[PDB]
Amino acid sequence: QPEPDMITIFIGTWNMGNAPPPKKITSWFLSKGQGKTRDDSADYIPHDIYVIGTQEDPLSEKEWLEILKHSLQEITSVTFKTVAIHTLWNIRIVVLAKPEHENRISHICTDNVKTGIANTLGNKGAVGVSFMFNGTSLGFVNSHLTSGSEKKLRRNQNYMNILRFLALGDKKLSPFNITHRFTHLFWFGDLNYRVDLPTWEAETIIQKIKQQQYADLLSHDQLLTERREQKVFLHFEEEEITFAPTYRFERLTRDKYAYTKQKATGMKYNLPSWCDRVLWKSYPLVHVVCQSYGSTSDIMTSDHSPVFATFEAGVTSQFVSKNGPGTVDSQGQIEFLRCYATLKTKSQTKFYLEFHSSCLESFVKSQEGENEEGSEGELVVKFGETLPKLKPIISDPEYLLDQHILISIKSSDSDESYGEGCIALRLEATETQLPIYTPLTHHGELTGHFQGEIKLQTSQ
Numbered sequence: 001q002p003e004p005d006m007i008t009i010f011i012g013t014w015n016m017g018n019a020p021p022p023k024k025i026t027s028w029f030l031s032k033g034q035g036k037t038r039d040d041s042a043d044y045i046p047h048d049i050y051v052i053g054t055q056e057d058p059l060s061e062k063e064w065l066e067i068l069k070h071s072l073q074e075i076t077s078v079t080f081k082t083v084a085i086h087t088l089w090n091i092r093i094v095v096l097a098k099p100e101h102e103n104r105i106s107h108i109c110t111d112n113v114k115t116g117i118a119n120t121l122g123n124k125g126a127v128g129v130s131f132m133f134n135g136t137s138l139g140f141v142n143s144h145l146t147s148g149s150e151k152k153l154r155r156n157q158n159y160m161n162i163l164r165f166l167a168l169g170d171k172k173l174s175p176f177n178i179t180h181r182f183t184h185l186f187w188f189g190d191l192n193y194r195v196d197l198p199t200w201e202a203e204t205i206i207q208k209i210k211q212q213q214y215a216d217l218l219s220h221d222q223l224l225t226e227r228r229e230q231k232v233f234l235h236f237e238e239e240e241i242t243f244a245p246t247y248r249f250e251r252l253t254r255d256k257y258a259y260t261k262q263k264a265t266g267m268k269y270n271l272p273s274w275c276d277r278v279l280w281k282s283y284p285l286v287h288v289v290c291q292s293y294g295s296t297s298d299i300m301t302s303d304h305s306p307v308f309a310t311f312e313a314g315v316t317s318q319f320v321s322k323n324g325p326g327t328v329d330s331q332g333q334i335e336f337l338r339c340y341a342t343l344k345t346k347s348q349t350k351f352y353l354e355f356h357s358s359c360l361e362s363f364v365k366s367q368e369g370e371n372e373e374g375s376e377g378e379l380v381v382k383f384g385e386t387l388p389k390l391k392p393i394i395s396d397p398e399y400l401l402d403q404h405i406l407i408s409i410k411s412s413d414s415d416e417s418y419g420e421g422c423i424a425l426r427l428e429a430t431e432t433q434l435p436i437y438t439p440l441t442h443h444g445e446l447t448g449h450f451q452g453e454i455k456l457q458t459s460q
């Protein structure tokens, strides 16, 4: 049986509004309704992995697993295996996979983060799952962020606390947060960002939704505007939105948005908004293609509509050679030339690099760089040709060109990372000096850049 080089992944997010679901929810898993929908000719074709995030979920794990598995069996005639399930309060993630993938999936990891302090600790946060699919690491985060149109900054803070504190993926990647630990990271949920228009415009917004004039409303979506200002979700991608706002509906119809302030809303307006979102971040030069992104029209138990997204995701095989794993392959090497980091820090310490990759037997520390002042105030840390030569475990270019090197720049004084990035080895040429580049982040915020040249030797 050949190992796959692509899988398809279903992501769902649904804030259930503390109500049980209706008897049929298959339109969700079939990507049918509004937006970018899946072709009818694919309806019997199972996705490889289904990741279901709920918020305000009233069901037990058992109750929801029975609904999910029976739903997928009806659609596909496949009995899916449960990879993982994790619940924090009423926030839940379920991962299901086709039975043929059971012996491809390993290193399963679950975690949660509770957001807020005192008043604001008690029901928001995130759950996540990670695992390996053969040679590819996959991460999934379902977050329910702070509600309310005037709390976008709180949502951004919630996001930072989640990516700092969620402990998924390889713990040996100690300098790296979840935004660097996975070949593919999917982050979805009731992110709760709103269409920021005046309350008086509520009926105008509804008009525009009825006319399917979404681009105009999207120019005021707080998640797009905060992302464009680099306040949140830096270096993530979202498909274009072509479906109506998924919140806030009257229950048992989709004909009516319930936006007016009520005691039950804390006297807050809920103008129609795209609360419910799917974003992703994949390592450079890996295949990832969004093939659906939309909302259902026929599931009406909640004041939110479910959202679906589906993806093609490149995956790699487990690789065994006569040499690595268990030793190095002397026919392989990775050389960094003429490298320098540009940092935004005002601190004066020396810095060194750490190189992490599953193509190395263990992480590699460089010598300290040479600090200089940039012509616009910046710290520049020069490594020249001083960086260690990296010795991969496997030299076969069918393996090595698919790998990635994570880089941390660390203070000699504290050994704390000031910035993290990622370099793909999917080069235009081997045995050739080629430019490389990554932005550097810390806690998901831009802290600098790393650039230089690489020279990759493979066995070919």
Ligand SMILES: c1ccc(CN[C@@H]2CCNC2)cc1
Pocket (backbone or CB within 6 Å): 224, 227, 228
């Ligand atoms: C929100 C809106 C627009 C953007 C910029 N576009 C991407 C830059 C790299 N590729 C496209 C980021 C966030």
Ligand SMILES: c1ccc(CN[C@H]2CCNC2)cc1
Pocket (backbone or CB within 6 Å): 081, 082, 083, 097, 101, 102, 103, 104, 105, 106
């Ligand atoms: C669903 C998918 C994967 C798994 C774990 N499989 C690993 C242990 C045995 N071989 C690999 C359990 C449930």
